Design a binder for this molecule. Structure first.
Ligand SMILES: *[C@H](C)[C@H]1/C(=C/c2[nH]c(/C=C3N=C(/C=C4\NC(=O)C(CC)=C4C)C(C)=C\3CCC(=O)O)c(CCC(=O)O)c2C)NC(=O)[C@@H]1C
Ligand SMILES: *[C@H](C)[C@H]1/C(=C/c2[nH]c(/C=C3N=C(/C=C4\NC(=O)C(CC)=C4C)C(C)=C\3CCC(=O)O)c(CCC(=O)O)c2C)NC(=O)[C@@H]1C
Ligand SMILES: *[C@H](C)[C@H]1/C(=C/c2[nH]c(/C=C3N=C(/C=C4\NC(=O)C(CC)=C4C)C(C)=C\3CCC(=O)O)c(CCC(=O)O)c2C)NC(=O)[C@@H]1C
Ligand SMILES: *[C@H](C)[C@H]1/C(=C/c2[nH]c(/C=C3N=C(/C=C4\NC(=O)C(CC)=C4C)C(C)=C\3CCC(=O)O)c(CCC(=O)O)c2C)NC(=O)[C@@H]1C
Ligand SMILES: *[C@H](C)[C@H]1/C(=C/c2[nH]c(/C=C3N=C(/C=C4\NC(=O)C(CC)=C4C)C(C)=C\3CCC(=O)O)c(CCC(=O)O)c2C)NC(=O)[C@@H]1C
Ligand SMILES: *[C@H](C)[C@H]1/C(=C/c2[nH]c(/C=C3N=C(/C=C4\NC(=O)C(CC)=C4C)C(C)=C\3CCC(=O)O)c(CCC(=O)O)c2C)NC(=O)[C@@H]1C
Ligand SMILES: *[C@H](C)[C@H]1/C(=C/c2[nH]c(/C=C3N=C(/C=C4\NC(=O)C(CC)=C4C)C(C)=C\3CCC(=O)O)c(CCC(=O)O)c2C)NC(=O)[C@@H]1C
Ligand SMILES: *[C@H](C)[C@H]1/C(=C/c2[nH]c(/C=C3N=C(/C=C4\NC(=O)C(CC)=C4C)C(C)=C\3CCC(=O)O)c(CCC(=O)O)c2C)NC(=O)[C@@H]1C
Ligand SMILES: *[C@H](C)[C@H]1/C(=C/c2[nH]c(/C=C3N=C(/C=C4\NC(=O)C(CC)=C4C)C(C)=C\3CCC(=O)O)c(CCC(=O)O)c2C)NC(=O)[C@@H]1C
Ligand SMILES: *[C@H](C)[C@H]1/C(=C/c2[nH]c(/C=C3N=C(/C=C4\NC(=O)C(CC)=C4C)C(C)=C\3CCC(=O)O)c(CCC(=O)O)c2C)NC(=O)[C@@H]1C
Ligand SMILES: *[C@H](C)[C@H]1/C(=C/c2[nH]c(/C=C3N=C(/C=C4\NC(=O)C(CC)=C4C)C(C)=C\3CCC(=O)O)c(CCC(=O)O)c2C)NC(=O)[C@@H]1C
Lengths: 216, 172, 162, 162, 172, 172, 162, 172
């Protein structure tokens, strides 16, 4: 009955590991779900969130915000996944967050904005690249929200979340490594307007041979 | 997240021990100050809009270039950002002030901020300046309210300062 | 930046298709119009100053109290600013004529207009007058299509301001 | 359906913004062009038949074996079809000239072209010749911009077919 | 979507024929009017803000209850919507006017609008009223411009009206 | 995005000045060439399929290995990609040509392209080669059209070249 | 690459569950069959050449005009290619038999088949004949399950080509 | 993905050749062993829960600290993760074992695992240890089943080992 307990050596604790990565609560995510009866506030909070998750976390002006999509949420008749479709089909996202960056760049950033995951393999990135010319851009983004896993988790009536930076199923390697690259600090946000323009955080070089290394 | 209480807990945990009686007495006392603490926060929130407005005016009177073509605060678009930013920082600071801990501020608000600013080309120095400008105005209110029971808030005032300063530093 | 030429490219690009006849037709439009547009710009650019003076002035007639002490219109600094600002509006307008699109206006002036104005307590109204007064003057130096173009853009701001 | 006019409306609509100068410029382009376009259509419409005969024919010269028994070009039914089909292509082309956009072409002809052709084993090549032969004839009845327009659209199909 | 040209095409398609010469002459003339057509649109867009502002004032002077507690335009939140709505309708109308066809307006705006309004408890009647108020003001501008080459716009003016009216009717 | 006009604007903005008369005369002249400019584009788009088809044939006649087992163009799947790629590049180039500016091309297409190719193991050299092959064929059409009013297109031809070359260079 | 074994792993993997009895049953199937599959491959591999010659040839009988000057079948280069290509098809087929899945076929041959063929104007038809002729010959050297397997795969391509 | 068969194919492809008769005989024999192969897998999957449970016990008896306050396996939440992880690794290993190829394991499971562990501050060494502990237990079952026809499984046993080891190595 010694009940030797003891401080131990490492003394890492719960919190320290995540502060080291710098997630600061980005990896933990609390999903937000809409209800058929909802306060306008509850709709607002959803809009607030939706914007952030699909946008770079870039600043959104009132002018930038599309009121017609915001209208209809109060009404109903728009599924929240369909609301999120309206965004990105928006000129706002295409002209900014699409034009500047390379095809590869927006694919990774879509795959981030719409889903937490960074891209597990080179081939799937390539699958969307086949689409670029194969079909119209609108289809390809539509394909993401239409993809199964978008549906599987936060499928309907749910704001997308950066479920990345936790264990998700079938993550082919370097989930954390790629995500570490793709997420800057919580305050920090991908910027439509940036020096050196915008380049893929993840090395094109990799996506197969090695784990990425990026400034944090 | 974290705050004064939670923090002390965590520390205790790693030692592997129940909370020291001494340590309780830190928290016990901290409680007593609550009322003061609260009013402090209230004062900021109450004056928020103005604090900013004010600080800005002064910022731009000083660093004329920011508002000139080629500067960072020009044109409107940018200006807007700059205002928004100031606000945010403030917002956080407040949060911290309530919590009784820097953390919240450091993590959500300051983390990565410098690098962002760099990438944008925003001159970190000026940002820092603004933060201070805010600081002084804010304290102004914290320290001179109306209809509140008279007493000493210094302790809180200084802690407030520190938060502002951590901000200034990590941005700069 | 939104101009005719950029847009058609954009639309073409989105679909993932080469520029076909459809778009070129559009582009052609932009180019034929330009001659008028360009003319207008040359006219505004030249009379800039005079337009500015006249406008600033007007505003004060319209809102006498502004010039009283303790107000915003009062003390030279403010007047200087007021001048500067209007210059800007004008500047951009010219730009937009030349670019053949609202683009320039949108990005410099319009985006973030509200919040700026709110936080510094600039009343849209003022600017508007400036513009209107301008519009009236422009309505002499120009004529026909050149004029029409000038108006369009001037207005576009009125609408954005209000 | 994609025409100049429809698109600008669409784009305006998406953004949720009034039609501003930008779009009108574009529109102006179209309708200015129309005069030429319209002319071309009147010319094709009139000579339709003759163009069709000539084309169908050509194809057979180009690919003699088609007319042999057991082939596709053989037996009247098929010939009738062959005629019909080309008529269609032509028909649409006219449409597109008038509409001032590829729209009509896209929706009737292009979309699903491949699979149709695959499942019935129609060789794109054939159609192409038809078109080319046509293009050559058209290159006499028309001239200047009218001509240019005619070509654009004719080609657009060549490219879609190939 | 659809417009005057496309429409005529579609009709022709189902008959299976090239366009009748008669039919061309509809479009040929339609082209000629373009310039007029355009200016009309331009006039609306140019005055937009005003058109609305105006109509609203009059709407609320008439139906005072809308703005009183318990009415549909109260409180602010609602008011805002109501303004926004008016605008939208206008926006569409314009679109149509350019196209030379009601469709766009009917399809993306009007269809099912009635029912919505019903479900909400918005009085369709009043909405319709507003539409007209707008109509009159709008025409006002279309029909009395400055610096445009003088001629007859009636043809266009009436078509404009009709669009407004389709709106009024389907809402009502 | 960007193009010739917008560009000049932007420059002027940072100086904080109205456009120089000299600068206008760049744009004024640019306008005059429009018609030529346009036809150039038209020629490319018109021949697109061919341009590629052609270039490919020549590419593969030269570098037999690409199509042999172990090469980069083998098997079908890969081949397809390689064709697609060429096309894309072309598409962009065209865009640029219209705009009167490299940007669009650089930003959407060329940026990062090299590195991609590297990571894949695609031989950058060969890609570049293809680009040129395309260039020559393309010019071929631009410069020898039918039914067009005869004149000098050189100015445009050269600018076209440059675009192709920026491509070649940044890939290589 | 799609084989029986890879798929079950994939499916197991997706769900995030261990390989249970269900999947193993499936795998077992693949292995039992292999004996027949393997046999077939040995037979094709050996007669390869002869099959190829016969096929190429056939195609020409079927489509005489190909061998005429100015056509695709004409001039040795093309003939060489034609040979090569068919070899490939065969090669892969063998592979697929051995791998126990369509996988090999899918990734080499099928994916992107259309566009390749379109851009170079290779008529699927041709290949098909090649295959058919082959199938007919194979229908002598083989028998029972070995045969059945051979067919399946050969066909699979016919269907993909058409 | 890949496995034994597919692999051999791929090799053959790059040579551009039909499969060597010699090479067939690799696969022919591989088939024969199937039955053995299968049972091996079955044994692991059947005992899964246990394998882990066991390994853990031993892991924690050895490295007491992991389970002590401040250690990496403490508190519950962490513990859970650590268990989950072990499982996963196992799961993969199994997969490989069936395929007859490391690949699957290397790609999805191993690649960048190390780096993850590093970033977290998890001690790679301990993880590796666990892997081995698992290995031994697992083999235990593979090699001593009930109701199976008695014969030699060594060949498979060793290949199993190797997989475990690749894991151990790349983590470590
Ligand atoms: C104002 C005192 C100074 C200033 C501000 C300024 N900021 C930006 C741009 C960005 N600001 C941020 C910062 C944050 N991200 C967050 O989430 C938070 C709160 C947690 C902050 C504070 C970001 C990410 C951007 C990028 C936005 C985007 O890409 O659109 C600018 C504009 C620079 C730009 O090009 O975007 C400015 C002007 N800089 C000054 O000049 C003032 C001294
Ligand atoms: C400090 C910067 C200035 C100051 C503060 C001060 N406050 C009190 C006492 C109280 N303040 C509150 C306020 C709140 N309590 C709450 O629960 C909330 C949120 C609903 C608020 C805003 C309360 C309830 C008290 C108790 C009663 C009272 O008002 O006195 C004091 C008195 C000392 C104490 O420890 O409470 C003081 C000094 N007064 C100043 O002059 C400072 C500049
Ligand atoms: C004129 C009608 C009135 C007036 C003007 C006035 N303006 C300011 C301050 C600002 N004006 C602007 C405007 C712009 N800056 C830009 O970058 C652009 C876009 C290109 C515009 C339109 C800005 C940004 C400011 C705010 C920052 C600043 O200090 O300039 C003021 C001063 C407000 C203050 O309290 O400091 C004034 C007075 N002056 C008059 O007399 C009229 C009422
Ligand atoms: C002419 C060069 C050759 C030819 C043509 C031919 N076509 C068919 C069958 C079809 N043709 C079409 C084409 C269209 N129908 C449409 O609706 C459109 C879009 C507006 C097109 C382009 C279609 C759909 C068919 C399928 C069945 C049908 O006839 O409608 C055939 C018959 C093939 C068969 O076996 O059914 C032929 C022969 N005829 C010749 O002689 C030339 C070789
Ligand atoms: C104003 C003339 C009258 C009025 C309008 C009013 N509308 C709402 C709410 C909505 N109005 C619409 C209209 C549209 N939204 C669209 O996107 C479109 C076209 C695509 C239309 C035409 C919609 C959809 C809504 C529903 C949700 C919303 O908040 O807008 C209200 C407020 C309803 C509420 O209870 O929240 C009002 C007041 N009603 C009046 O009082 C005026 C006479
Ligand atoms: C009708 C409601 C009122 C009116 C219109 C009107 N306009 C013209 C002639 C033209 N209007 C334009 C204007 C434009 N063309 C464009 O392409 C654009 C967008 C870029 C615009 C804004 C043009 C160019 C013409 C041609 C000649 C001119 O210099 O105006 C007329 C005259 C008839 C005609 O078609 O030529 C009319 C009547 N003016 C009125 O009197 C009505 C109140
Ligand atoms: C053809 C001339 C040569 C060739 C091409 C080739 N490319 C790939 C693969 C890719 N190429 C790209 C291209 C782009 N990335 C971008 O961002 C853009 C601009 C917007 C483009 C056009 C990319 C992303 C890939 C990767 C995805 C994919 O597989 O398509 C390959 C396939 C590589 C492989 O090993 O599978 C090939 C073959 N290679 C040649 O042989 C020619 C010299
Ligand atoms: C240059 C590579 C070759 C060439 C071109 C060329 N074109 C013109 C003149 C015109 N070309 C057009 C064509 C269009 N204008 C449009 O708006 C559209 C899209 C709707 C097209 C397709 C037009 C209208 C003109 C003007 C009328 C005319 O054809 O004469 C020229 C003449 C120079 C000039 O117009 O300034 C030239 C040289 N011709 C060559 O010799 C080159 C090989
Ligand atoms: C035989 C029935 C006919 C024939 C064929 C022929 N093919 C080409 C060119 C190509 N054919 C293929 C086919 C493949 N190459 C591959 O790598 C694969 C997958 C392993 C296949 C099935 C391809 C890709 C090409 C294009 C590039 C190349 O040069 O191979 C030609 C030449 C046509 C040309 O313009 O290059 C020919 C002639 N030859 C005959 O005589 C028959 C009619
Ligand atoms: C257990 C033997 C030792 C140990 C491990 C450990 N891991 C975590 C947390 C995570 N582990 C992973 C790893 C994976 N990502 C993948 O892609 C795969 C398969 C390829 C694995 C196995 C991940 C993603 C996490 C992070 C998120 C999460 O916790 O779910 C922990 C918890 C530490 C933490 O704070 O995250 C631990 C404890 N540590 C020990 O105690 C053992 C020696
Ligand atoms: C090796 C570690 C152990 C072992 C295995 C062993 N198994 C057999 C033979 C068979 N085992 C099975 C099992 C399956 N076949 C299937 O199709 C499936 C999936 C549903 C399973 C699970 C079967 C059917 C056979 C054939 C009949 C039999 O059970 O013997 C052998 C015999 C030799 C051989 O298969 O070549 C052996 C050696 N024996 C050991 O030493 C360990 C216990």
């Amino acid at each position: 009955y010694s009940a030797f307990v003891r401080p131990a050596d490492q003394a890492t604790a719960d919190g320290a590991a995540q502060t080291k990565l710098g997630i600061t609560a980005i990896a933990p995510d609390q999903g937000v779900e809409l209800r058929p009866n909802f306060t306008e506030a509850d709709v607002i909070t959803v809009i607030r969130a939706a914007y952030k998750q699909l946008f770079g976390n870039t600043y959104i002006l009132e002018s930038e915000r599309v009121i017609q999509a915001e209208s209809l949420l109060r009404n109903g008749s728009i599924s929240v996944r369909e609301f999120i479709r309206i965004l990105a089909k928006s000129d706002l996202y295409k002209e900014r967050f699409f034009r500047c960056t390379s095809n590869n760049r927006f694919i990774e950033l879509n795959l981030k904005h719409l889903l937490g995951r960074a891209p597990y393999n080179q081939g799937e990135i390539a699958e969307h690249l086949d689409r670029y010319c194969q079909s119209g851009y609108d289809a390809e983004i539509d394909s993401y929200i239409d993809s199964d896993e978008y549906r599987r988790v936060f499928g309907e009536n749910t704001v997308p979340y950066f479920r990345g930076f936790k264990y998700q199923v079938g993550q082919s390697a370097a989930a954390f490594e790629r995500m570490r690259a793709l997420y800057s600090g919580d305050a920090g946000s991908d910027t439509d307007r940036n020096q050196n323009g915008q380049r893929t955080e993840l090395t094109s070089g990799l996506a197969d041979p090695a784990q990425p290394v990026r400034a944090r | 997240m974290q705050d004064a209480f939670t923090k002390a807990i965590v520390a205790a945990d790693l030692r592997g021990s129940f909370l020291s009686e001494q340590e309780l007495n830190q928290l016990t006392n901290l409680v007593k100050e609550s009322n003061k603490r609260l009013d402090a926060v209230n004062a900021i929130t109450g004056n928020a809009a103005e604090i900013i407005s004010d600080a800005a005016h002064k910022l731009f009177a000083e660093q004329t270039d920011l508002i000139r073509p080629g500067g960072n605060a020009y044109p409107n678009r940018r200006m807007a950002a700059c205002l928004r930013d100031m606000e945010i920082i403030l917002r956080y600071v407040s949060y911290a002030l309530l919590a009784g801990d820097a953390s919240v501020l450091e993590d959500r608000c300051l983390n990565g901020l410098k690098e962002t600013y760099v990438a944008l080309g925003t001159p970190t120095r000026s940002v820092a300046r603004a933060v201070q400008l805010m600081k002084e105005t804010a304290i102004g209110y914290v320290n001179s309210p109306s209809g509140v029971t008279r007493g000493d808030c210094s302790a809180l005032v200084n802690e407030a300062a520190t938060y502002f300063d951590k901000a200034a530093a990590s941005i700069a | 930046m939104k101009t005719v030429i950029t847009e058609v490219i954009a639309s073409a690009d989105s679909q993932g298709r080469f520029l076909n006849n459809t778009e070129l037709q559009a582009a052609n439009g932009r180019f034929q119009r330009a001659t008028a547009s360009m003319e207008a710009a040359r006219a505004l650019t030249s009379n800039a100053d005079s337009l500015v003076k006249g406008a600033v002035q007007e505003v004060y007639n319209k809102f006498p109290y502004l010039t009283q002490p303790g107000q915003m219109g009062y003390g030279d600094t403010n007047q200087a600013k007021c001048a500067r600002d209007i210059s800007h509006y004008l500047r951009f307008i010219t730009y937009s004529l030349v670019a053949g699109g609202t683009g320039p206006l949108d990005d410099y002036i319009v985006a973030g207009l509200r919040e700026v104005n709110r936080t510094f307590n600039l009343s849209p109204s003022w600017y508007i007058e400036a513009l209107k007064h301008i519009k009236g003057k422009v309505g002499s130096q120009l004529s026909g299509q050149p004029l029409t173009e000038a108006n369009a853009y001037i207005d576009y701001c009125i609408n954005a301001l209000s």
